[PDB]
Design a protein around this ligand. Structure first.
Ligand SMILES: NC(=O)c1ccc[n+]([C@@H]2O[C@H](COP(=O)([O-])OP(=O)(O)OC[C@H]3O[C@@H](n4cnc5c(N)ncnc54)[C@H](O)[C@@H]3O)[C@@H](O)[C@H]2O)c1
Ligand SMILES: NC(=O)c1ccc[n+]([C@@H]2O[C@H](COP(=O)([O-])OP(=O)(O)OC[C@H]3O[C@@H](n4cnc5c(N)ncnc54)[C@H](O)[C@@H]3O)[C@@H](O)[C@H]2O)c1
Ligand SMILES: O=c1ccn([C@@H]2O[C@H](COP(=O)(O)OP(=O)(O)O[C@H]3O[C@H](CO)[C@@H](O)[C@H](O)[C@H]3O)[C@@H](O)[C@H]2O)c(=O)[nH]1
Ligand SMILES: O=c1ccn([C@@H]2O[C@H](COP(=O)(O)OP(=O)(O)O[C@H]3O[C@H](CO)[C@@H](O)[C@H](O)[C@H]3O)[C@@H](O)[C@H]2O)c(=O)[nH]1
Ligand SMILES: [Cl-]
Lengths: 460, 460, 129
């Protein structure tokens, strides 16, 4: 029936940019226009230095930009001529008012919905791509119906994104699945199938799953919650191991070889970070409370409480090992990003571990091979940062004269440091706190050198 | 290089029988003796009708029973001549005293350890196969050391079993992994390697996992807890689906296509049953309380609380839908086993759903195509069973004149019943409560017939 | 399990609110076979205190060596002076192994090295094991 030939995407961020670049790369006969109110970001997308780094993104953008891929600030015209409008704007957690710290702020979504229906005539498919609360598409449909024009036919779909930081291009070109939600109406099914035809240019039909709108919105939140639960579950086991003499890596391996459980996302850690795990679980908890489902709410709250407990007890282990006082002591923080091979620090466990040690008056020397130094200062600010926080240029400066080395991010270079050299210039006794299990197999060497080595999920 | 040549297994039950039968079948040059204090069970192993039924088991015993596989009641001699002693006795949940309903009763394990160290001389490997609490092998080692003899060297290992009902022979011949735990000492590592050599006759080397003793015991408990957590998580989502219009089957499919999450054990239900899920999760919770880990304890307690909530809300949904009273009403309970294709009813959700409706004075007519009627009477007893419970011999008798049909077990035949016939002789309005999603795709046909059809994870 | 001492303190036969009653009931709830000896408490009183199970689990011994014969543990609840002077090498020979002594009154202080040499695992209140 209907064929999508022109695509507009509102939001040229971590999601809108790469997704539309790949669609343009895979669909040569489709014009794809990405729009954003942030002009510096849009100009960056047309500049030869893109505003977000993803492996393979530069080659894909440069192969389409100007031909069928466009980045613009002319939002109204892009909406006007588009057959399909992606909504890919930010939905941050509300930091204010009712639902503070749990509910999502929908003001940017609503601004899009108002601006879309203002600049639209005829038939258009509007697709929710941002992570939204369940039934948010009902709000968009209400706004569209309450501002309808003659011959204005706007169809609303849900199409969540599942890409992860660092592998976006591979995830977009070979996705585990593409998820599309729509109404069970004849009009909805025509819009769902039209969006399926776009993805069918490079995604097998067997990988394209179509559901109703609410199942699609809920699936995005639930998927991230299931992932975070695996991390919190194995972290809860790490605490059991420390008290029993078991080893969390051995237990995780034994658990993960059951193919019904799987062997992915069972790496114990000081705690999961990233911009979406805590946000999506807390949103789920808030949604359940609003729907009078307190049992479900407290069920998923345990994922967050366990992650916070894993962080706090790790900070307590450092403080207790350092003779119950770390005031004016130099402590090396190796790793500040929430995972390796990135500079993103949002909700990184290094932030919370650092603030715990700062509350005790410790002198932190933080080294991360990729995180910008200005970001670390901003993250540790609410003064206290000037007195206590020092950003080192290399790990050996951070460990010079330190009582303990705290590894919070699994950077591969930390495995290869010269620890006999580090031990010589550390105050004695010297401690290593491995919050990522990156030094496994090196404990006998480190103990022979003279370190007291402690790691998560291993009895001391 | 020590070589295990004679194996004794104390306990000829669901675990000891099949495991030793497979070891005998795969190791023709190893004598395997399975002993037990129950003579009627031992004779049933030697009779042409086995006490426990498992597909393919009857062929394995009959191919070895007499060559290298034996079933005797002479426990003392089997221990005397064995190089390897399996402990495969029952470890029930304590029904009394401290830890009631959570801790495991170790009196049978201790009986083995005392009897072994009395009937043993020389070198023997004693292996924990029963599900035991963490550090239970430490207790076995204390009994052996406190009753030492000259020339007595007893090594203690952990080797849990992961077989499931219905696929025991398949799981034993092709296991996802074999888990062996022992002490990290030369005496222990030697004993570990001897037991690996037995399994190496038919299990690839990379699938044989060696850990310390505590990791092995803990891995058995944690593996079942992770599996139960998946069911409770998807069940918690089913409640969210009913309140939002999403569908739990669509959401589970969308979640399961993430290969990091996997698509197994995501089938929403009225609640998981079986003899080990609740027992192992509750034991884990009890262990965390004894070790002063209340955060970990309440984390895993949520798996049980969610399973209880899913059961109670399903019963409350039936009562609320039936105009808030079901006293003296006829209700058909289709399915009493804890899963399909078995007669086992231990911790079956049908037991708890039935008791909820019995507390309301409902007249239950229960049909299960495989559960013995005497077992159903035992499960629903403490009277109340005589007045309220009727055990039908076909589903149509149970649905004759009933207000509602409650499906608790996913037997395939329930999808194939004649529902026009059932509707004609049911009181009106007639309800179907599908606690297993077995009638999916039939909702339009059932609604046209006149049923009010309600299922878990689907808005009414 | 041998219960040495049932009165609430030494040099009396009074058992009112004695800790031996509560310690015994805790072990009885666990199904233990209690053999109770007290040099002054009337045996009929012990039965009344442990009543509302007493027939199955509670046995009142006439001497301490009878109570410790074949027992897993010796639990001292009353500070009777005679308990300090028992022949523990003799008691250890007829006890199941491992054999434990739980001193709830600190009456065996200073005797721990001998008892450990004999083979007892000796535990008392206010002392790390
Ligand atoms: N970060 C991830 O990896 C990822 C993965 C999947 C889902 N998501 C979800 O995708 C959404 C987008 O995330 P992101 O990281 O790309 O966000 P982002 O903040 O980087 O991008 C949103 C962009 O939209 C612009 N914008 C906001 N309101 C606008 C409006 N009214 N008109 C035009 N432009 C507007 C912003 O200036 C920004 O450039 C979020 O809801 C997020 O939860 C994120
Ligand atoms: N699918 C499963 O059922 C399964 C899976 C893995 C692990 N397990 C664990 O395996 C263990 C055994 O389970 P089961 O179902 O085989 O139990 P079971 O009751 O069928 O078998 C135990 C057998 O041991 C005998 N026995 C008990 N004490 C004895 C003693 N002192 N001497 C000799 N024989 C003695 C009993 O008479 C009985 O025949 C349990 O701890 C269970 O949790 C069960
Ligand atoms: O076994 C594990 C796996 C991950 N983590 C941590 O979990 C966090 C999240 O890492 P990861 O999931 O790889 O990164 P994200 O970029 O946040 O990706 C997630 O969040 C995205 C944003 O919504 C989703 O789209 C993706 O599906 C989901 O993988 C990081 O702090 C990791 O170190 C662990 O501690 N142990
Ligand atoms: O998606 C699912 C999967 C299972 N179940 C239920 O979960 C229970 C357990 O099912 P299953 O795991 O197949 O039964 P068991 O035979 O008890 O096997 C489990 O328990 C054994 C120990 O008894 C372990 O060894 C096995 O690995 C583990 O699968 C049953 O009530 C099922 O109906 C669900 O409700 N949804
Ligand atoms: Cl609030």
């Amino acid at each position: 029936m209907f064929e999508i030939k022109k695509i507009c995407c509102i939001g040229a961020g971590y999601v809108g940019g790469p997704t539309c670049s790949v669609i343009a790369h895979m669909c040569p006969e489709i014009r794809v226009t990405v729009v954003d109110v942030n002009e510096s970001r849009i100009n960056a997308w047309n500049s030869p230095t893109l505003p977000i780094y993803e492996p393979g993104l530069k080659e894909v953008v440069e192969s389409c930009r100007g031909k069928n891929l466009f980045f613009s600030t002319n939002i109204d015209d892009a909406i006007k001529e588009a057959d399909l409008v992606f909504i890919s704007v930010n939905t941050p957690t509300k930091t204010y008012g009712m639902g503070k710290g749990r509910a999502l702020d929908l003001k940017y979504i609503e601004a899009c919905a108002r601006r879309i229906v203002q600049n639209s005539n005829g038939y258009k498919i509007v697709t929710e791509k941002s992570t939204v609360p369940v039934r948010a598409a009902e709000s968009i449909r209400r706004i569209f119906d309450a501002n309808t024009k003659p011959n204005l036919n706007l169809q609303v779909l849900s199409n969540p994104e599942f890409l992860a930081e660092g592998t976006a291009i591979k995830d977009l070109k070979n996705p585990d699945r593409v998820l599309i939600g729509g109404d069970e109406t004849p009009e909805g099914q025509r819009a769902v199938q039209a969006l399926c035809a776009v993805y069918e240019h490079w995604v097998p039909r067997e990988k394209i799953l179509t559901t109703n709108t609410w199942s699609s919105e809920l699936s995005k939140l639930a998927a991230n919650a299931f992932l975070a639960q695996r991390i919190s579950s194995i972290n809860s086991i790490s605490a059991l191991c420390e008290a029993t003499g078991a080893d969390v890596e051995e237990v995780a391996t034994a658990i993960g070889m059951d193919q019904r459980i799987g062997n992915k996302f069972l790496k114990a850690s000081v705690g999961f970070g990233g911009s979406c795990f805590q946000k999506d679980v807390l949103n789920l908890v808030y949604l359940c409370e609003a729907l009078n489902l307190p049992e479900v709410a407290r069920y998923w709250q345990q994922v967050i409480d366990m992650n916070d407990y894993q962080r706090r007890r790790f900070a307590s282990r450092i403080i207790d090992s350092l003779f119950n006082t770390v005031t004016d002591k130099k402590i090396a923080i190796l790793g500040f990003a929430f995972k390796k091979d990135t500079g993103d620090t949002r909700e990184s466990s290094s932030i919370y571990i650092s603030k715990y040690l700062m509350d005790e008056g410790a002198h932190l020397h933080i080294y991360d091979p990729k995180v910008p130094r200005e970001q670390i200062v901003v993250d540790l600010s609410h003064d206290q940062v000037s007195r206590l926080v020092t950003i080192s240029k290399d790990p050996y400066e951070a460990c010079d004269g330190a009582h303990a080395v705290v590894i919070c991010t699994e950077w591969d270079m930390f495995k290869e440091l010269d620890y006999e050299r580090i031990h010589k210039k550390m105050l004695k006794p010297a401690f290593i706190f491995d919050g990522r299990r990156v030094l496994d197999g090196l404990h006998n060497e480190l103990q022979t050198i003279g370190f007291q080595i402690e790691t998560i999920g291993k009895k001391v």
